[model samples]
Target chain A: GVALGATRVIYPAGQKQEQLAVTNNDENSTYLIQSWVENADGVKDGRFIVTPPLFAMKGKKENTLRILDATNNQLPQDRESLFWMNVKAIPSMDENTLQLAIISRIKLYYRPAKLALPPDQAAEKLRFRRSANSLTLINPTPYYLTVTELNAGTRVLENALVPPMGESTVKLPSDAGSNITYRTINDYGALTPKMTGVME
Target chain B: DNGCSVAAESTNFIGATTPVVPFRILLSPCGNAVSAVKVGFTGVADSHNANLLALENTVSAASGLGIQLLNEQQNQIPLNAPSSALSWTTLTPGKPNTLNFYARLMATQVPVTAGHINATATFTLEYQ
Candidate 1:
């Protein structure tokens, strides 16, 4: 078995690299560790380089994987880009038996150096409008807005992910009120204070 | 809310009598705020086992298998039940908290088939 130091990694712009600690928890079994980066579409990406792409780790050993920016300044500088980090651990087997190779994937956020607003303020900048049977959420900020909670009157609407400089529409209940309340996930993976807005 | 969207895949090549063990898959991290936050799995129940959850098998194969979610206490967590969700009362301010959940493949019926099992489950993080 293997464990990661954190569930997510945030690569701020202008930083050379980010580090993720990987530890093999099995005391008697060694593993072949493989790491790579992928885009949102699950395609292998070359924008970043993961050090120690493939290696061998003994039992009860720990290693740090470094993610270095290899993008030749092609990523957007106005908004944040999201990627995925995949780490797979294949156990060393002596005999021919069923082996379960577990692959752990987590999001990697590439935040540009200077955005128009800070990430904490991104939720407040969200806008909403009423359609026939849905509500459109508009995110005008430079950060990804993960709406963890959305309520229309007493009815709880489904959560949504409003991309930076983009929008997402969600189904609204027929009897739902026009008053909307939402809470976003912050950079620390905590919920932000609830914010209210009126559908235009 | 500060958690990343993650998916862990367990590629199992099992034999007819292979023993299935529960493995820990890391879910997105939730933050510890001053107020207590509610967290649990929100999705449809499995067809084979009503109490357990289901992962969509990419391959069109019937393995008569279901997935079970267990908390740190080793108790099964029901899907789409907010009332039975776990609540965190402690607040660590800026620190991210990990809710450990273990997943195991269960045989819903006799004669579990052995093959390449590829399944995926999309989970929603519920917050109060």
Candidate 2:
């Protein structure tokens, strides 16, 4: 009884980092690692563990089963960095653009692995960002957030207010953990499909 | 000269002038007093025609027993300070000199909770 068809949210789309693959489809193919939590009357409570549930159908083509989900990285996750996406857009930084006010910080980076975890082991690094839930100039001027995590040194989660696109519910701070880390700093020279493709 | 009262008064709900936070008054964790079932509180200090006294007090520290206030009505619920206020009652009752106050803490060895814990009760006020 598990249900989650399609859910999306991203803050700086155009590519910073976003990948999810969890295999527990039943019959033989196990690999899973997850965490994401926040509770204080703003629910999104946590706890998830799935590693190789089952899958085996060789020769006829059966290896297209990918489930590697990741968000802000669990446990109070530095405040809020939820990731569950499927292509929406924002990353319009054509060039030389860094003055969201002198660029302080914002972090969220993950290479946590699956199907690619054998390069001498080095890419499970989580750099927990905390300034109290990332806060910027505040506007649709250049806004993008799925759950939340915009860390670089310490400035994001001090009050947290950056998640305004689709499928909402983000309010963090109640002590959670999972090496939570996310990064950003005026996101140097940013530009994306800010606006110019909406015929759907 | 304020709310006119040639009166008698009483009040207390965790004296030392009550003020502390964290589950402010909503008590009784376990039943005592031969299986308890009541505690009280209701307040209106100056309705004039005054005669007041309110009861219910419990304080034990080291990390336990709390609920410093609630449903406490006082006009003279129960008072015995020096020997003249044992459950006194009279907010405004009698032939000539009347006014009694008592915020209530419904009693039965007092202890009640369906989902209420954390308490401390101490209250006292006197005027004549």
Candidate 3:
């Protein structure tokens, strides 16, 4: 059998991750999130969610990934929809492992597109009704859904191999300067579906 | 332990206990929330890890602290378990890793204040 070893992955430290609002999530409703990969090594702005990968680069469908809301089911609880985040990555001091460090406070929000409520899931039965209460309060017991690929930023993967002749130092795609094409995973093994509004 | 939930502020000076010591290689979460910070100090590198030198260039370090693209999934991927966590990762199990850069506080001689002084340092993160 090919030798195998155990490796751990944690997000790095020092990136200004996004602060998800309690208004960004829903029970079943859906809303759109936007992010762009530019000047990443700089202020490290835009697209701050970083869960885990649902699948590998060429991962098989049989596999799944799990993310932890381990931080808590709540954000900066002190305020409304406002959230906080910190993305960090570091190399192990003694080993070849890497840490994908992320300190995030996501605000899970529900869709407010003014949809004709389905008779069953109407506003009357809701705790905080949008119809009666014009003010859409951030869900008190909110559950954060961090999207790594679609909602989060990019993750860098390194490839290595035993060279045939001389030295075999793996190299990144030089032409792919500052371009991240990777997606993030969630606690449900969910991968972001393809979109038409995107341009890579 | 302060618990798993990280403190709101960023003044975490946990690893600063030792004058100049290294933490263990974390294969898993340290699972502790960091709270409050004292300060930081930079000491000259020991006879060990030569690459463990002082940070020289600020621009490079600043420019280096950015996002790194790991993998692409046309669909959103859920990072739910350790079993599938390693499917596509940013680290190499056994590679020669380098401390591309580091930020440290002012260098001072021994017999100095142990707790901490009003000081700090800065650094950047890389995908490598």
Query: Could you give the candidate ranking by TM-score, starting with the highest?
Result: 1, 3, 2
Worst 10 residues of 2 chain A by lDDT: A96-105
Candidate 3: tens digits of C-alpha lDDT, residues A84-186: 2222211111111112222221122221122333312221121211222121112222222221221112322232111111112222333333322322222
After superposing candidate 1, which stretches have Cα over 4 Å from the reference?
A: A93-99, A198-200, B1-128
Evaluation by TM-score, superior candidate among 2 and 3: 3
Which lDDT tens digits does candidate 2 get at residues B24-104?
221112111111111222222211111222222324211112222222331233221321222222222112332222232
Q: State the lDDT of candidate 2 residue by residue for A1-200, as single tens digits.
A: 01011112222222333322211222321222122322223244322211232333222122321223333443332223333211111111111011000000112222222312231211111112223442232222113321123322232332122432222222234453323333221222111121211111
All candidates' TM-scores?
Answer: 0.62, 0.17, 0.22
Error (Å) of candidate 2 at residue B54 is 19
Interface Cα RMSD in Å, per prediction: 8.2, 34.4, 16.3
Cα lDDT tens digits for candidate 1, A19-118: 9877775687787888999876667878988998999989778899999998877899999897878777666544111234555556688998878698
Query: Who wins the DockQ comparison?
Result: 1
Pairs clashing within candidate 1: A185-B1, A189-B2, A189-B3
The true-versus-predicted C-alpha distance at residue A87 of model 2, in Å, is 33
DockQ of each: 0.11, 0.01, 0.04
Error of 1 at A63 (Å): 1.6
